[PDB]
Amino acid sequence: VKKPHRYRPGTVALREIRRYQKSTELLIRKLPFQRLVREIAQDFKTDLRFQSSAVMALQEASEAYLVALFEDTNLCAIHAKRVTIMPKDIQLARRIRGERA
């Protein structure tokens, strides 16, 4: 007899888009990314140490690359008359960029 205030799907998504394009703080949590970086590095040399600045630089580079990739992915998804990005969109973006063979 009242109904809660549910925003129509796609509204909070746009609000989040605005919020996260307005800000600059890193979006990936720091500890999980550091653990991932160390695990990946473990396959090239054992008993490696990382300067905190090194992990931060890796995180910034990775986040910037992923954001640019998602921009290209959204462009491809819109090109297909879609609104949802799908793995095929990421694959096409990477293929055109020249990253994926």
């Binding site: 746009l14 888009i17 979006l27 490696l48 580079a61 990775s62 992923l66 954001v67 992915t73 990005i85």
Partner: protein
């Protein structure tokens, strides 16, 4: 260290997509993004560790990462160099 790629949670990928201007995200996108991120990190950390080994250091310095990114064509400002 095992199964840390899943540390890049679904909401984190959602935030990255939102910063990229994405409104709707398919469910399969998260695993694909994790794979792409793993490939990128493997490509970068390989060169970073190569630089570290050449310097005969056991510590990967931020300047090694910066050199690796510059080598790959992704120059990064704000960490020296």
């Amino acid at each position: 260290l095992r199964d840390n790629i899943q540390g890049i949670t679904k909401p984190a990928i959602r935030r990255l997509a939102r910063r990229g201007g994405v409104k709707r995200i398919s469910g399969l996108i998260y695993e694909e993004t994790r794979g792409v991120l793993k490939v990128f990190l493997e490509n970068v950390i390989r060169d970073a560790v190569t630089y570290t080994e050449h310097a005969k250091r056991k510590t990967v310095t931020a300047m090694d990462v910066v050199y690796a990114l510059k080598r790959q064509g992704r120059t990064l400002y704000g960490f020296g160099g």
